[PDB]
Structure 1
Amino acid sequence: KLKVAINGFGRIGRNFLRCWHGRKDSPLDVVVINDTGGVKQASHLLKYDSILGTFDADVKTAGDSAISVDGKVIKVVSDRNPVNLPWGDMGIDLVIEGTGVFVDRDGAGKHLQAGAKKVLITAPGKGDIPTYVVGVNEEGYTHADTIISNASCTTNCLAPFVKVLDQKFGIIKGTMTTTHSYTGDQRLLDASHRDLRRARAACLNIVPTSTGAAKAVALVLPNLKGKLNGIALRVPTPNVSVVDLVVQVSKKTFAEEVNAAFRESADNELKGILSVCDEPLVSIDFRCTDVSSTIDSSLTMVMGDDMVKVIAWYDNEWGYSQRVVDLADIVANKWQA
């Protein structure tokens, strides 16, 4: 029912698109979407994915203007300016900006300008957005935020458990790192990009970096700041990535102590959100997997009952979208506007 169009029909565009098909009970009437890229491409792009494979969802469309897929015919155009991107022609309900290039509220404003009602950004918006993230900023979340954001998958995934750890054991200091994959955020080749590292090709090289995680943690976790700071490690992989953090937790504990604690959480709430296990499973074992990350039980060592390594294969793309999808439909509900 939510007449929605997302900006930047990236993988996550397809993801949520697939999630639209994947997730059941989708009031997300996303009958339009934006990406300045070629739409029939995007169609085939939507049609054909690498990781989760081609979206076998056959779509029959008559004319460039109207496109229909799985009954839910869905428009899409290609343009840069959200004002040049008419939204009132549908009176758009929600937008998410997969481009990333609109990393400030103005574009959303500009999206709100052309006739959008609500906005969130999977990416941490530069500056003028208090982000919303499940587990962290979905509780005090208000549907009445016509413009909000998510953070990078990293934060979008690394959040809850350690907060609950912070809830159940506290953390003196946290040193978070990820196996952050590669994306358009980095240059395939050593193409000219602001971050020299993201500029490089690095087909097999990692990027020592720091995503908004150790920053968005501030918003999403009003407590865990500075003390609980690590960086990002943007790796030469395209796919589901892994958390790599060692904490100096506050309360004395040991490995399993958090595990069942981490278990029970997913056993009730991080259900769908996150997971935990110790069966050795590698990336391929996490295709289109939604429980953002199962945490290792063995290698999650604990030293002095505070120094605690943490590790979990996480879906930087689909589970991210999952999480992105999560509150997305939630704001569709409590549909104040």
Structure 2
Amino acid sequence: KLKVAINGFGRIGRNFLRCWHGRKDSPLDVVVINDTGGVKQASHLLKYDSILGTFDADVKTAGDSAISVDGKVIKVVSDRNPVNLPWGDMGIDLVIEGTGVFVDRDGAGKHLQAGAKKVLITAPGKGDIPTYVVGVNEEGYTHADTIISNASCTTNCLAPFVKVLDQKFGIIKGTMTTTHSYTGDQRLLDASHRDLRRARAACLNIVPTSTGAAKAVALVLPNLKGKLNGIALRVPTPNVSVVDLVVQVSKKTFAEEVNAAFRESADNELKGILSVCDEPLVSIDFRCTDVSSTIDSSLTMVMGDDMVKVIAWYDNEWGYSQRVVDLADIVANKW
């Protein structure tokens, strides 16, 4: 139904495509991809992937500016400068902005110059741009919004249960580490990088970095402004990340009661978004799970009586892309 274009056909982009493609009765129709990489490359990389594994579809080139996915021809255009793209002419309604570069209203604003009606950025914006997280504040999406964000996938992991915690015990202050699967921009071998931590061999190192995720939460849960801070440690697992959140709450509680509250929500207001796992699983068991955030219930601790600790696993790539589609077809669904 909704005329959809994907800007950028790297990990996030391709990820969105196969996510959308696996859906029951998608309100969305994807007609075009803007990628400078070329049609041969876009095809190949869409079909094969070390993390998501081979795509279960007939993916091939259809001429020299399109790919088919089981017959379904998708168009492929190739401009570096977004103001050019034949959006207008192709009557595009929603752009998935996955390049990572055009995060402001001034960079992303270039898409509505090509004559596109709405833009969804797959990354936090630099102010004045409304971020949204399905399960957290999705209710607040006006149709008037021309440019919207979906935040980091860490924030997509963290916000849902922070909501639950805040709603039910009342976060006073808290801090958080994100044990995080290594990520594209890091260095295979020690080499040049603006972050001297991130210049360093990704496969050999626990590498510390800043995370936007803590302050970023405040954007979608205003009640938490300046109550959280964080750090990330990139580790040599390719995918699947864990958040390690310590908060102090106002309602005296205990480990078991916390876990009950998450289950309460996992079966109700967050069904499909939050899960609670009561099994002794390891990181690679959360590969390809459809939820933003799974609480590892055996690991929840409360010291005592008000400092609560919570460990949640998230699939950094797939779980996030799932949300992007969840957001995109709310945009579509209420037109």
Q: TM-score, normalised by structure 1?
A: 0.93
**1:301 CA drift (Å):** 0.6
What does the per-residue CA deviation read over 1:147-167, in whole Å, with 9 as the maximum and x for residues that have no partner?
111111100110011212100
SS in 2 for 1:164: helix
1:313–1:166 CA distance, 2 compared to 1 (3 A): same
8 Å contact from structure 2 (residues 293, 313) kept in 1: yes
Q: Distance in 1 between matches of 2:238 and 2:218?
A: 28
1:250–1:9 CA distance, 2 compared to 1 (3 A): farther
Q: Distance in 2 between matches of 1:2 and 1:19?
A: 16
Match of 2:219 in 1: 219
Structure 2 residue 311 is the aligned partner of structure 1 residue 311? yes
8 Å contact from structure 1 (residues 274, 290) kept in 2: no
Kindly report structure 1 stretches of 4+ aligned residues shifted beyond 4 Å: none
Q: How many percent identity over aligned positions?
A: 100
Select between 306-315 and 120-129 the one with higher mean Cα deviation.
Answer: 120-129
**1:60 CA drift (Å):** 4.6
Larger strand share, 1 or 2: 2
Select between 146-155 and 176-185 the one with higher mean Cα deviation.
Answer: 176-185
SS in 2 for 1:83: coil
1:35–1:126 CA distance, 2 compared to 1 (3 A): farther
**Structure 1 residues not aligned, in runs of 5+:** none
**1:309 CA drift (Å):** 1.3
Q: Distance in 2 between matches of 1:159 and 1:110?
A: 30
Select between 322-331 and 176-185 the one with higher mean Cα deviation.
Answer: 176-185
Once the two structures are superposed, the pairs formed by residues 43-192 of structure 1 within 5 Å of their partners are 43-192=43-192
Alpha-carbon RMSD: 1.7
SS in 1 for 2:188: coil
**1:110 CA drift (Å):** 0.8
8 Å contact from structure 1 (residues 190, 200) kept in 2: yes
Q: Distance in 2 between matches of 1:324 and 1:62?
A: 27
Q: Distance in 1 between matches of 2:60 and 2:227?
A: 54
Select between 22-31 and 60-69 the one with higher mean Cα deviation.
Answer: 60-69
What does the per-residue CA deviation read over 1:28-61, in whole Å, with 9 as the maximum and x for residues that have no partner?
2111122332332111100111112111311354
1:143–1:204 CA distance, 2 compared to 1 (3 A): farther
SS in 2 for 1:110: helix
**1:300 CA drift (Å):** 1.1
Q: Distance in 1 between matches of 2:105 and 2:163?
A: 27
**1:298 CA drift (Å):** 2.0
Paired residues, number: 335
**1:22 CA drift (Å):** 1.9
Q: TM-score, normalised by structure 2?
A: 0.94
8 Å contact from structure 1 (residues 270, 291) kept in 2: no
Q: Distance in 2 between matches of 1:242 and 1:47?
A: 28
**1:79 CA drift (Å):** 3.0
SS in 1 for 2:3: coil
Q: Distance in 1 between matches of 2:75 and 2:128?
A: 29
